[PDB]
Design a protein around this nucleic acid. Structure first.
Ligand SMILES: [Mg+2]
Ligand SMILES: [Mg+2]
Ligand SMILES: [Mg+2]
Ligand SMILES: [Mg+2]
Ligand SMILES: [Mg+2]
Ligand SMILES: [Mg+2]
Ligand SMILES: [Mg+2]
Ligand SMILES: [Mg+2]
Ligand code: NA
Lengths: 153, 179, 173, 57, 221, 124
RNA sequence: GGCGCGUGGGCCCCUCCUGGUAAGCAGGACGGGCGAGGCGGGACGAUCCGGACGCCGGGCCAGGGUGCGCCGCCGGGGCCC
């Protein structure tokens, strides 16, 4: 039919991975979260309390509440021609920290370090801006070529 | 012909450029201050002309008590208001100040004349300080109207406004589970 | 109207292949854009190198002479409406670029095969003693003669301008 | 007499007509569902700070 | 903008600025003619020297394209509409300049069947700017007929006359963005085509043409 | 006074749709408004439609073929006043003025050097 | 942000599907069109191929074509009830 129970159409997204059944490792409980941190949502099918809805599987958001046992996560959801901010409570088995800012943090650190380095020696500051791949430059190649031909059918 | 003009472009906006009032005094003042701004480019004059174009619902009145409270660290400056100045009987005593307004109540005018203050007209402000040197521009609270407080949907969970008429029942008016 | 091009190409150097091997091919095409397209077409299929992973080192146009007449043998494969077939053809021309035009026109008129439906395997010049087809052979001999194959065309061509004439012209032979 | 049951044919075009509206910039800092003990401590720490307390005198 | 100086001071300073611009124009024209000749000669010499040593000389890749819109405005998909808006190609037979990166190249590939593009020559660029050049000033379309306008609007980027503008376009210098956006998109005459429906590679008309863009456009200026 | 040459973008009048087939439909212009109307769609064979664009150059709008601007009067006083710009304005006597008044007005106008467009009327 | 109208029988094309022997049949999906889009072409058509429109003079030319009706053609290679 068409019924829309809380867990409809979850035959594949809530199943365990191959040879990864059973209890979760203990790193999922003793890692530290702070307000404003970016996290990912991935549902674990062996834990049935604090489970988010199928819609939130594979989204990223920020922490707005640190609780005794659950976290509060803010997520942007599009509804028709508008975006709504949804706040949900998730238990620890369904949340992982997100590396969506690691590249920017490393870029900032490197930019500052390079700026410090050349100043002490006085060397000119290089360009600290990313470049989209530019066209190739002039160069010279050697020839030991192999003749290529088309085969018969 | 034959061009695309609706891809990264939005519809035009409508704003007031003229006072819209039949009163000839307001037309004269608006034109004079527009000329002054044309010949100097000063920001005070630009904001003044814009204010003179506003409608009555967007020009709330200002009291003498509020004016006194707003001139605490700047008693020597001139307060400029593009609205009427009313009286506040709740304030027994008022200090000495200079105010330029569109209109004054008879009582407010008399109270200011006593205490040694000065009530000024926009004509004299134009004559003396066209660019608003040593002047402060002030306005009232635009959200004070009783009509403004009834905007929205009373029956929704997240609104904080009251219905418009008189209601005597209980369904949906006694908590989130009154429905 | 074809030209002949020599194209050089290589895969871009990688960390585990600092100096990749170079490949050379001979292409007949109407211009150099088409020549490079066909080069990449064959390199993708034969060496597993796409245009995005490689680079073209040089596309050099080569002009022949064109004074005497030679016999050319062309080996090709083309796709029909029922699969693919091999084919050998013989043409008589002054240049190899001019022989390709004749071959393409014959394939279009007789088999209904277009430029992008044909693959030229090899083009070589044949001696008069090893010709395979009868038309080329009969034209390779000495002291060959025949009357004009279509003398009516001259008379027909002149009637387009002189619409009305005072007698029916004869066809000289 | 049967009529159509459902179509979403024109709905994506209507959504994009005035852009996709973003949320307000105050919805990100609401206290709507925060832990009460944290909120109470934040209130008392501010009030006792001389440099940021709004208590008169 | 309000000026404090009197009329005579403005007149005198204007004359001084005009003289400076004229001198700069003459110098730059001479320098750039020499530069173009030298570029061609050096490339030839490199080819010969490499050839003696059983080597191939691979020249530089194109840095700027000239892209022209060849298809109309009826029945266009949304993504194509957006991309064509971002290139400033809003009408059929308009043309623009474009720098080459992976970011721009991939978008061009997505809109391929609406445009044709290639690498221009100095002569094409000069003809386009001299005969069909207009400037975007405060949202108006102002004709370019003398070097005073260029100097007034682009002096802060060391661009003082038509020769500098041509050189900056051709070389894709450090001030390509400002110079390119200073120009209004070119409104060319109608185009002569072979077959609008297919790619140039297979005998059609849209896509990459290489150097044939020069003749294709020379018919249109 | 010299002026530019007068151009009329259209010489004929705009006739209402289908007014040649019925006496009850008058030729004065009305905008067609039917759901199937063929003149609303403007198919190739229909008659032209009114629009801004046929407008006259505003340098010569309202100018008579003689090159003057028309001014209607009915009294001798109306003539004396508001005819100091006699360069561009000519006088036209209203329909209902009688023969005696017309005589007086013509004498005054001839004295003042003002042109009269309908000078020959009521002269038998 | 305020106030307010019309609409709530839709249909067609491209590509992807479901029921049915099938249907110019019935039911769904991304994008476009007609509805509410003039003009040229497809002999002839609401939707196909081009092109989306103030009133005019001049030039260039898309799509489609160039025996005569009816504006506009030749040259070259092959086949041929
Ligand atoms: Mg319905
Ligand atoms: Mg198509
Ligand atoms: Mg008329
Ligand atoms: Mg109905
Ligand atoms: Mg049907
Ligand atoms: Mg209808
Ligand atoms: Mg439409
Ligand atoms: Mg004819
Ligand atoms: Na039509």
């Amino acid at each position: 039919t068409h019924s829309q129970g809380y867990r409809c159409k979850t035959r594949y997204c809530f199943a365990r991975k191959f040879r990864r059944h059973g209890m979760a490792n203990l790193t999922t409980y003793n890692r530290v979260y702070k307000l404003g941190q970016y996290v990912n949502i991935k549902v674990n099918g062996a834990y049935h309390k604090g489970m988010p809805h199928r819609y939130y599987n594979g989204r990223t958001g920020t922490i707005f509440n640190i609780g005794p046992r659950a976290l509060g996560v803010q997520i942007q959801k599009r509804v028709r021609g508008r975006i709504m901010l949804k706040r949900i409570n998730v238990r620890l088995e369904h949340v992982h920290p997100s590396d969506c800012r690691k590249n920017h943090l490393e870029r900032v650190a490197a930019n500052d370090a390079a700026r410090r380095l050349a100043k002490e020696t006085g060397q000119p500051v290089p360009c600290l801006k990313r470049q989209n791949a530019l066209p190739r430059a002039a160069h010279v190649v050697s020839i030991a070529s192999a003749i290529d031909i088309t085969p018969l059918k | 012909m034959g061009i695309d003009l609706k891809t990264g472009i939005k519809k035009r906006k409508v704003e007031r450029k003229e006072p819209k009032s039949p009163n000839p005094y307001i037309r004269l003042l608006h034109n004079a201050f527009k000329v002054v701004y044309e010949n100097t480019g000063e920001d005070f004059t630009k904001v003044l002309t814009k204010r003179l174009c506003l409608s009555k619902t967007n020009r709330p009145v200002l009291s003498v008590s509020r004016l006194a409270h707003l001139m605490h660290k700047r008693e020597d400056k001139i307060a400029v208001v593009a609205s009427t100045v009313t009286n506040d009987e709740r304030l027994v005593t008022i200090p000495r100040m200079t105010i330029c307004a569109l209109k004054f109540s008879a009582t407010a005018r008399s109270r200011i004349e006593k205490a040694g203050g000065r009530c000024m007209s926009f004509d004299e402000l134009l004559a003396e300080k066209p660019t608003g040197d040593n002047c402060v521009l002030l306005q009232g609270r635009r959200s004070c109207r009783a009509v403004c407080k009834k905007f929205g949907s009373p029956g929704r969970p997240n609104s904080h406004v009251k219905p418009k008429g008189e209601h005597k029942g209980r369904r949906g008016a006694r908590g989130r589970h009154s429905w | 109207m074809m030209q002949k091009y020599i194209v050089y190409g290589r895969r871009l150097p990688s960390e585990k292949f600092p100096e990749p091997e170079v490949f050379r091919m001979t292409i007949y095409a109407p211009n150099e854009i088409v020549a490079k397209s066909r080069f990449w077409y064959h390199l993708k299929s034969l060496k597993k190198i796409k245009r995005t992973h490689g680079e073209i080192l040089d596309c050099q146009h080569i002009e022949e002479n064109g004074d005497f007449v030679k016999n050319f043998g062309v080996l090709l494969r083309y796709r029909s409406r029922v699969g693919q077939h091999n084919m050998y053809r013989e043409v008589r021309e002054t240049t190899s670029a001019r022989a390709m035009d004749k071959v393409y026109s014959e394939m279009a008129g007789q088999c209904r095969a277009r430029y992008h439906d044909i693959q030229i395997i090899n083009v070589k010049e044949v001696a008069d003693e090893d010709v395979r087809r009868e038309k080329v052979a009969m034209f390779t001999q000495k002291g060959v003669r025949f009357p004009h194959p279509c003398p009516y065309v001259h008379v027909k061509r002149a009637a387009r301008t002189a619409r009305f004439q005072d007698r029916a012209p004869h066809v000289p032979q | 007499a049967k009529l159509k049951n459902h179509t979403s044919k024109n709905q994506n075009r209507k959504d994009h007509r005035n852009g996709i509206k973003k949320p307000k910039k105050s919805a990100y800092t609401s206290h709507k569902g925060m832990c009460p003990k944290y909120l109470r401590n934040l209130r008392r720490s501010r009030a006792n700070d001389p440099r940021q307390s709004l208590r008169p005198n | 903008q309000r000026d404090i100086r009197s009329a005579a001071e403005r007149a005198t300073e204007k004359e001084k600025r005009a003289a400076l611009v004229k001198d700069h124009a003459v110098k730059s024209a001479q320098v750039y003619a020499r530069y173009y000749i030298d570029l061609v000669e050096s490339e030839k010499k490199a080819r010969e020297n490499a050839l003696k040593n059983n080597q191939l000389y691979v020249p530089d890749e194109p840095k700027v394209y000239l892209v022209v819109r060849i298809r109309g405005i009826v029945g266009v998909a949304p993504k194509v509409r957006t991309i064509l808006s971002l290139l400033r190609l809003r009408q059929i037979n308009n043309a623009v300049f474009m720098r080459c990166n992976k970011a721009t190249l991939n978008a061009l590939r997505i809109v391929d069947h609406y445009v044709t593009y290639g690498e221009p020559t100095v002569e094409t660029i000069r003809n386009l700017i001299y005969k069909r050049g207009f400037a975007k000033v405060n949202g108006q379309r102002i004709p370019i007929v003398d070097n005073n306008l260029i100097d007034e609007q682009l002096s802060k980027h060391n661009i003082l006359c038509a020769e500098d503008l041509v050189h900056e376009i051709f070389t894709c210098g450090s001030s390509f963005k400002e110079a390119n956006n200073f120009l209004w998109p070119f409104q060319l005459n109608s185009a002569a085509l072979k077959d609008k429906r297919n790619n140039f590679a297979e005998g059609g008309d849209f896509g990459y043409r290489g150097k044939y863009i020069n003749e294709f456009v020379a018919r249109m200026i | 006074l010299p002026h530019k040459i007068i151009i009329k973008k259209r010489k004929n009048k705009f006739i209402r749709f289908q007014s040649e087939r019925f006496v009850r439909v008058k030729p004065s212009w009305r905008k067609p408004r039917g759901i199937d109307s063929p003149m609303r769609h403007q198919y190739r064979g229909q008659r032209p439609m009114v629009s801004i664009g046929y407008g006259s150059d505003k340098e010569t709008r309202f100018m008579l073929p003689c090159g003057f601007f028309k001014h209607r009067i009915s009294t001798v006083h109306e003539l004396k006043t508001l005819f100091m710009n006699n360069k561009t304005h000519a006088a036209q006597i209203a329909h209902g003025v009688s023969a005696r008044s017309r005589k007086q007005i013509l004498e005054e106008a001839k004295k003042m050097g003002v042109r009269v467009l309908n000078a020959d009327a009521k002269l038998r």
